[PDB]
Amino acid sequence: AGAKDIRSKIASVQNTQKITKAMEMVAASKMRKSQDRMAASRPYAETMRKVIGHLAHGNLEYKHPYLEDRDVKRVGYLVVSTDRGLAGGLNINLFKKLLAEMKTWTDKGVQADLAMIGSKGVSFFNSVGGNVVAQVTGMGDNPSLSELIGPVKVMLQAYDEGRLDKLYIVSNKFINTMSQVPTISQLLPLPASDDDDLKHKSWDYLYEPDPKALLDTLLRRYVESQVYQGVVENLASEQAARMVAMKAATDNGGSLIKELQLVYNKARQASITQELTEIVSGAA
Amino acid sequence: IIYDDLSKQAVAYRQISLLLRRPPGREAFPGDVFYLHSRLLERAARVNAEYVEAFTKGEVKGKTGSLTALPIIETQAGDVSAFVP
Amino acid sequence: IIYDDLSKQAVAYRQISLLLRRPPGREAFPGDVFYLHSRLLERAARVNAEYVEAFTKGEVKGKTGSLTALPIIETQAGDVSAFVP
């Protein structure tokens, strides 16, 4: 206490308010760039899904494993998490939803399996004791598909090798700048769109060399693309969450300055009074 | 009975006291700034029927008088923790 | 030697000074409250063997003497700036 300590504390809180204002600005610009990098990713997945729609269950169809709902004896999850803190409640809401569903699956006696994108989830699920089999970390704000090839390779290999029976990606969904929602959604076996290529009756492809070898790579590339889109939406959501967190923190710093200054003024007045009284009432 | 400001009574007493060279205490209020308000507000009382009988020489029987006080105090910046409040 | 709360000897000396009408310093402490504690604490010393021989008139030779002091002070709200600390 005393005017000098409180004045030092006011100075430090003003500095904190500067820092958080700057972090809010930066997060807003990176949100814009990340939700451009997000929109740039749609065409690939959107056309590849129409190709698969025509080739898999169109006017002709095939019997690839990834398309059939076989019996669930254990599940795998791909978890997207940030690499950086100060993002608000994002990661923990996501992880609590994930744990709530993994609880059901393990109650039914089916095991669960995890592969981690980002280091926050890695540390968290190491602390909880989940089974993590593959991870990639330190992508930061520069996600690239060539890094996601590993962890999704592990899960696909373990799927068609018969050691999984369902595969999910769990990630946040960027909806509106002020709102973001965690979602667990399935990507194996392939979920069935209502797009009708019954109008495509009018034709069929020439397959070089044959359709069966092509459907396989199309499905693998499609799964990799959806995982990448999940990563990128989660990145834009991290930015849009850090923005609002830092806005709130700047307002809290501002509302705290106004209390520290009342305490400071009271201490200043008390010190003037005590000094001047000691002098006057000491003399004579 | 309503005292419209007992902060301004305290300030006027502080004036009268400092003009008499009396050493001040916290926030420059005199030593007996508590006794000032204490001996005032302690009169707002309720008294039993025997006190009323004895005081009024037996003219009033079985009634109990009372005086209810609502003092008003003004607090600078919402500080309920200063010497006079 | 462990002087317990020398911050309470300073208050006793302040009382004695203010009753003798001596000029009050900061926090009403007397002027020579530094000289009060200084000449107390400068007695805790280690003395060389020659001073001990001269003092004991030759009875003790070749031994140093020593007195160690551990005064205690109490600081209100971590204020090491106050006059006594």
Side-chain angles (χ1 to χ4, degrees):
Chain A
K4 286 142 281 275
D5 305 0
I6 313 195
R7 192 165 55 239
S8 183
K9 292 184 188 305
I10 292 162
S12 79
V13 178
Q14 291 176 338
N15 177 49
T16 288
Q17 203 178 28
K18 298 277 172 56
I19 291 156
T20 59
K21 180 68 164 193
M23 292 185 74
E24 178 194 12
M25 293 161 61
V26 175
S29 74
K30 291 190 183 191
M31 175 185 72
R32 294 313 197 200
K33 292 207 299 177
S34 295
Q35 75 182 8
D36 290 336
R37 207 199 297 103
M38 185 196 312
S41 188
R42 300 297 195 217
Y44 182 105
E46 290 183 7
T47 188
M48 184 162 283
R49 185 50 170 87
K50 288 191 298 187
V51 177
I52 298 158
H54 183 297
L55 184 55
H57 56 266
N59 314 129
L60 35 63
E61 51 197 339
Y62 297 71
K63 292 148 56 179
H64 189 79
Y66 299 173
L67 278 45
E68 76 196 10
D69 314 87
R70 73 188 189 216
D71 58 299
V72 185
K73 287 189 287 273
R74 48 192 291 200
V75 180
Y77 293 88
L78 277 152
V79 187
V80 182
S81 60
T82 71
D83 265 317
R84 293 168 293 207
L86 293 178
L90 201 71
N91 286 320
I92 305 306
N93 289 349
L94 188 66
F95 301 157
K96 285 189 307 190
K97 184 169 187 161
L98 204 186
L99 277 161
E101 294 214 1
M102 192 154 61
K103 168 56 176 162
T104 297
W105 280 116
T106 187
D107 283 345
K108 289 178 171 61
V110 304
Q111 306 186 241
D113 211 320
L114 287 156
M116 303 305 310
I117 317 301
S119 55
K120 285 281 176 172
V122 166
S123 69
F124 178 100
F125 284 101
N126 281 348
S127 78
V128 167
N131 182 14
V132 168
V133 300
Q135 80 192 40
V136 65
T137 56
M139 302 204 306
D141 49 2
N142 288 120
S144 59
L145 195 132
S146 49
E147 283 184 301
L148 297 168
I149 286 166
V152 315
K153 178 65 141 85
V154 172
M155 301 296 269
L156 290 184
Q157 178 175 80
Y159 182 103
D160 52 48
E161 192 163 87
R163 301 191 286 116
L164 281 78
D165 295 307
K166 198 170 282 249
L167 186 68
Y168 295 87
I169 178 156
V170 52
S171 168
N172 294 274
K173 307 297 284 163
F174 178 82
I175 294 181
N176 290 327
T177 307
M178 311 313 303
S179 55
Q180 307 102 22
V181 63
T183 58
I184 301 161
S185 68
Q186 179 180 233
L187 46 60
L188 296 176
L190 202 89
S193 79
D194 301 0
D195 97 70
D196 264 324
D197 70 296
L198 308 185
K199 275 31 80 174
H200 292 172
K201 276 164 184 183
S202 36
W203 54 269
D204 180 21
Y205 287 120
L206 281 159
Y207 303 102
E208 309 202 354
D210 75 79
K212 202 175 70 67
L214 291 171
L215 184 64
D216 176 37
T217 68
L218 280 171
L219 290 165
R220 291 177 134 69
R221 299 292 177 279
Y222 184 58
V223 168
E224 282 152 22
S225 177
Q226 289 198 150
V227 174
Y228 170 84
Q229 287 192 349
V231 163
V232 168
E233 262 173 41
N234 193 98
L235 179 60
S237 187
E238 174 189 336
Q239 304 298 342
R242 179 178 295 110
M243 160 166 180
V244 70
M246 297 291 99
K247 177 48 173 162
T250 296
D251 290 356
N252 292 346
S255 94
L256 202 69
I257 299 303
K258 292 306 194 73
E259 296 296 316
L260 284 175
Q261 276 168 342
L262 300 176
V263 185
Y264 168 75
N265 284 308
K266 174 162 50 177
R268 176 189 70 88
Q269 295 178 23
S271 78
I272 298 165
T273 309
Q274 287 308 308
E275 168 167 66
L276 185 47
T277 296
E278 283 168 5
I279 295 167
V280 171
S281 101
Chain B
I1 178 158
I2 304 204
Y3 306 115
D4 199 8
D5 233 304
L6 281 197
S7 303
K8 288 165 168 63
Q9 195 216 15
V11 166
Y13 186 55
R14 176 175 70 185
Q15 160 171 348
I16 293 300
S17 190
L18 288 174
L19 295 173
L20 301 171
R21 309 293 308 191
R22 285 176 184 162
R26 180 179 283 266
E27 294 180 43
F29 280 109
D32 56 299
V33 71
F34 167 82
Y35 181 48
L36 174 78
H37 290 161
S38 174
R39 77 187 193 259
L40 171 72
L41 290 164
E42 199 71 2
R43 305 206 219 167
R46 174 178 167 138
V47 294
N48 54 49
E50 287 77 33
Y51 173 80
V52 180
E53 286 174 38
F55 174 94
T56 201
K57 307 298 186 175
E59 302 296 343
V60 186
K61 307 288 185 59
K63 301 190 77 177
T64 63
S66 69
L67 171 68
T68 307
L70 302 181
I72 291 154
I73 282 284
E74 169 174 308
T75 223
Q76 308 284 146
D79 195 25
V80 70
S81 148
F83 195 40
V84 159
Chain C
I1 195 156
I2 306 224
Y3 307 110
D4 218 315
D5 249 51
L6 273 191
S7 69
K8 294 186 189 305
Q9 174 190 44
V11 165
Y13 186 59
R14 177 175 67 188
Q15 167 178 340
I16 285 168
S17 296
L18 290 172
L19 294 173
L20 297 172
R21 309 295 304 196
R22 285 176 178 186
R26 181 175 161 218
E27 298 178 39
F29 278 101
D32 61 344
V33 83
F34 183 104
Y35 180 46
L36 174 77
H37 291 148
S38 166
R39 76 185 194 273
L40 169 70
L41 287 173
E42 290 278 314
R43 299 206 212 171
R46 184 176 182 204
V47 301
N48 61 54
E50 196 62 41
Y51 164 89
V52 178
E53 285 169 37
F55 181 92
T56 63
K57 292 168 170 286
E59 298 290 350
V60 179
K61 309 196 209 298
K63 292 212 295 172
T64 57
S66 157
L67 170 63
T68 311
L70 283 98
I72 293 167
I73 289 285
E74 170 183 324
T75 41
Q76 315 289 161
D79 205 27
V80 125
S81 156
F83 198 47
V84 162

